[PDB]
Amino acid sequence: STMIGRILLTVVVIFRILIVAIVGETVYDDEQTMFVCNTLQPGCNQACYDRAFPISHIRYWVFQIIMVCTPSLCFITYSVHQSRFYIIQVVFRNALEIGFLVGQYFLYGFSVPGLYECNRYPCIKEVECYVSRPTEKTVFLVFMFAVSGICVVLNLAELNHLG
Amino acid sequence: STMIGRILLTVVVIFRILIVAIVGETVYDDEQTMFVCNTLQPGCNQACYDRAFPISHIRYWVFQIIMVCTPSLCFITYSVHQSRFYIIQVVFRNALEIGFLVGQYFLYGFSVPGLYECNRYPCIKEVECYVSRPTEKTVFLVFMFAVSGICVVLNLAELNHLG
Amino acid sequence: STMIGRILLTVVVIFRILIVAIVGETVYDDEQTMFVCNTLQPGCNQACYDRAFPISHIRYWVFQIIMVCTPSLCFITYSVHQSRFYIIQVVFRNALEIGFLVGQYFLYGFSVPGLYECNRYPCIKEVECYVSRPTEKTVFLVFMFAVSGICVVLNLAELNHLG
Amino acid sequence: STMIGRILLTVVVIFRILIVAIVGETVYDDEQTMFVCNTLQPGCNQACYDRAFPISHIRYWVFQIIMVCTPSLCFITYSVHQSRFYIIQVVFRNALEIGFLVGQYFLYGFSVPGLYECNRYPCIKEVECYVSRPTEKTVFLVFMFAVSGICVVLNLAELNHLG
Amino acid sequence: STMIGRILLTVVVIFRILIVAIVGETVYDDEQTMFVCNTLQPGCNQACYDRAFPISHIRYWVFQIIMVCTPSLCFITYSVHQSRFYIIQVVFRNALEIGFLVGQYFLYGFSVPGLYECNRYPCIKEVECYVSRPTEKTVFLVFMFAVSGICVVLNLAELNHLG
Amino acid sequence: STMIGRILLTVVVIFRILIVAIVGETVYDDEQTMFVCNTLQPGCNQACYDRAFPISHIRYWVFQIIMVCTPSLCFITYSVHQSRFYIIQVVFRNALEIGFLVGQYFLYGFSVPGLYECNRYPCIKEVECYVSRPTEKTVFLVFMFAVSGICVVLNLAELNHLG
Amino acid sequence: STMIGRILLTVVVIFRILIVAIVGETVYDDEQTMFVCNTLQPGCNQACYDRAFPISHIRYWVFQIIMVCTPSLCFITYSVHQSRFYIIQVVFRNALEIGFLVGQYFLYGFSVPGLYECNRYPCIKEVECYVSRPTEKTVFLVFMFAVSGICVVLNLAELNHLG
Amino acid sequence: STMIGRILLTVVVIFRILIVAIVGETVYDDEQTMFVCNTLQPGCNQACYDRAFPISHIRYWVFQIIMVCTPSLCFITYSVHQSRFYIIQVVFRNALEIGFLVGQYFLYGFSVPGLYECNRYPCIKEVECYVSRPTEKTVFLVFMFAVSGICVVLNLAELNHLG
Amino acid sequence: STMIGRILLTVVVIFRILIVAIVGETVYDDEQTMFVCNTLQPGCNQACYDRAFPISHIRYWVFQIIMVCTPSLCFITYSVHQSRFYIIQVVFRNALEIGFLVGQYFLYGFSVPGLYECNRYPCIKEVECYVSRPTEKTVFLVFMFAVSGICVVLNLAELNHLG
Amino acid sequence: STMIGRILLTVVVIFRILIVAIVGETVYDDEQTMFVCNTLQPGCNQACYDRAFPISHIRYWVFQIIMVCTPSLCFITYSVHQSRFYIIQVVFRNALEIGFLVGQYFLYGFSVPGLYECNRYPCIKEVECYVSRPTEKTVFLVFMFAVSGICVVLNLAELNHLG
Amino acid sequence: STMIGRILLTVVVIFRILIVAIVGETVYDDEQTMFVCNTLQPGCNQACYDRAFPISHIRYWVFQIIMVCTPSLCFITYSVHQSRFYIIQVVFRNALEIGFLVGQYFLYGFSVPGLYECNRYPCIKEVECYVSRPTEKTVFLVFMFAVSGICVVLNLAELNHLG
Amino acid sequence: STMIGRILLTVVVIFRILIVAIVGETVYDDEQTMFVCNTLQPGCNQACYDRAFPISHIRYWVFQIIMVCTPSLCFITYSVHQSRFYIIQVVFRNALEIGFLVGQYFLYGFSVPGLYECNRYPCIKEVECYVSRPTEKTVFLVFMFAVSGICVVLNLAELNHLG
């Protein structure tokens, strides 16, 4: 019952990592080339794009994948050079993944709107801008949040048993 | 008679997976760059493209390839760490592939039209938009539906024998 | 005399497969970007391109390469799991390659014209469109038809001996 | 206490090297295509871009990654051909990394502004130009400066013990 | 004296093959995008480009590299399945390489002009068109002709000795 | 003292080769797309670009890397088939690298100007053109000249000892 | 009381005629140059302009001015060549002016909208078009209808007295 | 009865002449600027405009006004220098006006279509072109034909009496 | 003292009328061609121009010139057909000119701003538009208001004496 | 018989002069704005227009009208200040009009072609240009040549009688 | 001596008035269409044109012509209705013309520069703008100032004699 | 002999004045709109046009017509208010016309070139610009110089007789 969950964690991790490496890289290719605003101003496309999407979805997910696999790198490299390390590494993984999930919800939310209203310099008054591919990016948002939730839950399976 | 079908399933799976990795990625390269609508409105190209093609054909097929190979990943990883697992994994594969096939038919259908009629904001009244490469995408649709059907049938070969 | 022909078949197959993987992919890169029609109509470039070239040359050749190597995949995978299989696989290869060659001649012919005359909707009356790179695509057509003919002939060498 | 720090240095190094190889290459793809100035002058976009960003962020970081791993290449190649080499290589690594960090702060600083004011020939009087993606490049700047600081500190851990 | 020449042939062959795989592919990237003619006619750029450069330089060199290495593939595959084969393969290599060299001189010549004069349909009367990068393509032409000559000469070294 | 210099030569060679393979390829990507001249003439951009930069910086450096490693290829291939070869190969390497360095200085010099003055046909009288990225290309020029000098010096270390 | 009304009719007539000759000609100058529709279709601007404004306001008013002064031309030319003519000419003037007023109301109405919805060939489905200067043309419409009403009333003053 | 008709002829003549001098000149101002064809060909707008409208409506009407008033100029100038002249001048006026009316019907007809189909050189195959203001030009056509008919009839009133 | 004021009224009237006929017509020529708004919307230039300037300055002044000279036309035409008429005509002129002056102040005010903020359909949110020639139109506004005031005052000179 | 011809000369002269003043001025309005050539060259439109039409049709006809009425101006001004003058003036008129007619035929001919082939600097090789309104200008050419012929003939009527 | 000066004043006045009515109106036709600034900003052309030329040269000269002829209109209209009026009118003319001349020098100066430097909103920092036809406008400025000076002097001739 | 020359002077004067008022005004209409230079610089068209044609041909001829008729205005106005005036006026006319003719030759010369070479700021180095209509302007130049010469000669006829 409790033993197999490790199989589930490993498989969702590698799954999680190749959806994000083979699918996500090309939904987000033309983000800024196909982002258009309704103005004649130079430099308002750049301002309003950077205000709407300060850090892209896929950069945050790459960093979140790499950062929650660093504790394992420590646990491997300690073994090669040679259980108190084990529990520490597990609690640190749990803390990192919860912090990253809640930071995700607070950065992005649950949706990607199709319109944005922008009032940064050099734009005059407020302007309207149009996102390219909002429904696919919404589906990807919700899929990553669900997988993140599943691994949060399964990591919390192991915590209670030994702790 | 019944024994060889496994050879056929494995070969159609790897076949299925490399047509989709070497051919499909570049029919769908210029989908949004070569999608044109008949208007002067900013932001109606984005709205009407995202309404016509909410999730691209090839993202659904990547996910369908990866998702129907996850049960095997569980069956391998259980064997390394060490028959009731076997039958469960087979029935889950069958259920997943049937659900994905019927979801495909209900998302996309059997054709890709050359014209689309769109009435989303910011577009004014209804507008006409023009798909790039509708015949090749139709041939690919029908080919994937046929291969999906073949593996559905051959998976259902094995179910009856043991079950 | 008869024995060496297998060497010739294998070498023309791998030859055939790397000309098509290293040369063909970039003659056909800019096909639709550099296809131009003589009109002011939106959406007539897409219609007339898709009417002229319903399935690209190189997609048909990829599929023809992959499809005429699937019988060997069956013959290998049967041997790993463990002569009546042999002759069946050979006659199926022959039938597949002849069907694909004649289907090629009936799809494409022997030439690629430099002009095309098109009368699809949304185009008004008939229009004239201009193919990019017709001579190189003609040379590639004729080269693939000749190599296909050579392997058809050499496969038919083996049929008569055992059959 | 002191022994494990080597694990931390190695892991931050490989970490540091793959964030920079998988993330950084595509924030900086469209830097000059999406850099716009407010003029009708030919050649003022080139002048003002090259004045604002004389050496890109990511070229400096590639060179800094490669240059602070060359002492290890010397220490490996000496061992294959066959402790005084060791301490020398460590002090040289420390000196190189401190020099590169302070040179970074003096080249770039801590921010990337969204506007630039430029008065190079051929531009007339002073002109205003607009950076694409200033917030993401700022986050990357600060992240690289923090990781550089961490490895500076941990290298200085080892110096005091033997020295 | 005579023995070492084989070392020279092998090294010039691999040399010849990686200059052509790492350098040549990107001189010829923008050939048709940066080819411009002096007209307002649709479809005269395509006609005049295809008349000037019917088969690109680098496609001919790829085919010439692959075609003059096929005899060795026959000589290897015969050895695995198991001197009269040897001499035949050598004379065939010599004949192939001389035929390809002289065909090169008769297709392309020794120069790439910077201007071209074109009178194909749909162009009106004769028109003037402008080649992009003629000096680099000339240097590459002459370099490939010189290396081809060197291997022609060294192959003819071996012929006389045994023959 | 004299023995270790070989370590330094090997490491600067591989260093030299990966700065040039990972950094240089993308400074020189948009050279001709972002090269602009001040005219309305068709075909003066092509003429003046090819007059300013007859052979790109990075093609010369690729060829210089490959050409000064061919003597080692001869020395390896002789050893496999089996000291007079050794000294010959060293003097040939020295001669090749000095010839390539001085040819570099005579082709390019020490700078890349930001303006160019051009009077080739089809341009009318003399025209002014604007280089993209002159400071980064200058830094790369000077870096390659310095590394070339270092290996020239260290090769000349070995010459005197045996000679 | 009744006698002076003729003074009022003559003065409103000449008034009516010079507002229409000095003011009206240049409100209606740029009508078709500044009429814009929201499409990319050739020839939909012409179709939709001609459907919206089949006969311009000012052509109808010129014809109405000229046509209701022709009876006086008959009455003058009869007198030069030399009371039954008089009453006939008056009743004909009355009939003409009432017919022209009611025809005006039935052609144009009381307003000029700022938007028009158009579904003529070559336009696709229905389209939206934008009138230039709708408020000034509305003020002119209402002013001409009021003056027309005043002269209708004053002509009907004279009818009853003699009739 | 018969005497007054001369009053009617004179008044319709001056009427006819000022509708044509004050109204007609500006319906036909932008005829060729606002005539558009559906092509990218240079010089097909000129060819197809000149094929559709070989002689403008208003040039024919100016000439018809001037030509049917020349007999009166002869009759006046004869009287100043000083009945057989009279009847001759009347029959010549009648013949001229009938010839001009029937020539009008045979040149232009009764309508102005909104579309024209054109196959003149330099146009490719047949093309579609769009007339500006077809309804107003139709109303003017029919009005001039009706007035021409009225004066034809009234001239034929006088012929029978004396003749 | 009181007698000469009539000379002043007549001369300011003809003065007033030729400044407005020779100067004003061409300040207001390019009003709508040189009116620009900051948007990509079709039809927002028309909407926002017509909202900013519903009736042009010069149409109101033409009508005000013509309307305050109609009482004199009545007083002349009464005299030709033949003091109670006199005083009535004077009080009506006074009332008309005061009503027109105060209506002017309430329509236009005392300034013409260089910017306008507009939120009419089809414009999105509020937009900014730019008036051409605001200082010259301001000088003309103030000049016409001053001359109007002077004639108001001098007309009120005559009222008190007889009344 | 001979006496009336003077009436015919005077009337054809004034006729000739008002067709040319009321019709001709606006066929030739847009001659150079609507003259298009098939090139991208600056300044080839100007060169080829000025080569095709060195002196416009209507300037030659204005000068021919004014120059053949100057002898009458001499004959009038001599009479005011106060038969040998008479005959001289008539023979000079005849000589002037014949010289102008034959000069017309030698300048222009009898047609206006729709295409022109031009090889002036700055044009490259020969180019094709397209005349606007060639049929109307042909009709005007032939009409002026016929009227010129008629007055030539009638002037030659008077010569023989007195001479 | 003193008597003839009146002839000179009248002739310079009518001279002055027809140079300004026949020449000046078309130097100043394209002033704002051919005024260009070096920016991409909407609305900076309007701002900077109106800042450079607040009131056109020719409007000031029209007003100066009309205003210095109003005293004569008073002197005529007084004579019709019927020497103290005379001297008053002369001193008022003198005062008006001197005030207008010095106001001219203080508005415009003696030159029209070819460049203007502008820093009004919406322009960013300071911008450079280019005047069309500065030398002709300078010649006209100096000519009007000289003629104004001549009439100032000759008016001052008459003042001293009677005064 | 000597008496009639006055007839010739008067007629050439009025002739001279109406060729220049009816023909010249529209050769010089599009001078600056159809003047094109070969650059991308803003403001180089204005600079180079104003350098090439500082004062237009037709402004100089208007001023020369008006200035050589002012002495007659003096001679008329002296006669109305009432032989020493006569001779003075004649010598002044002669001096004015000779000065204007030689000033013409020194301003303009005898030709109008089709190309101009310009090196004014803001133009970069020297540029080439293209005159519109050089042959017609040359014919007009030579015609005005010939007529000017004729009146110079005939004025000099009268000088000698009385003087």
Numbering used by the authors:
A (entry chain L), B (entry chain G), C (entry chain H), D (entry chain K), E (entry chain I), F (entry chain J), ...: 19 to 100, 196 to 276
Paper text:
Connexin 36 (Cx36) is responsible for signal transmission in electrical synapses by forming interneuronal gap junctions. The direct connection between adjacent cells is made by end-to-end docking of two hemichannels (termed connexons) from each cell, each consisting of six protomers, thereby forming a dodecameric gap junction channel (GJC). Cx36 is mainly expressed in neurons and forms the major component of GJCs in electrical synapses, playing important roles in cognitive functions, including memory consolidation and epileptogenesis. Here, we determine cryo-electron microscopy structures of Cx36 GJC at 2.2–3.6 Å resolutions, revealing a dynamic equilibrium between its closed and open states.
To investigate the possibility that the pore-obstructing densities correspond to flexible NTHs and CLs, we performed a structural study on two Cx36 mutants: Cx36Nano-ΔN8, in which 7 N-terminal residues (residues 2–8) are deleted, and Cx36Nano-BRIL-ΔN16, in which 15 N-terminal residues (residues 2–16) are deleted and the CL is replaced with BRIL. The cryo-EM maps of mutant Cx36 GJCs reconstructed with and without symmetry imposition showed similar pore-occluding densities, indicating that the channel pore is obstructed in the absence of NTHs and/or CLs, likely by lipids. However, in Cx36-WT GJC, flexible protein domains such as NTH, CL, or CT may partly contribute to the cytoplasmic layer of the pore-occluding densities.
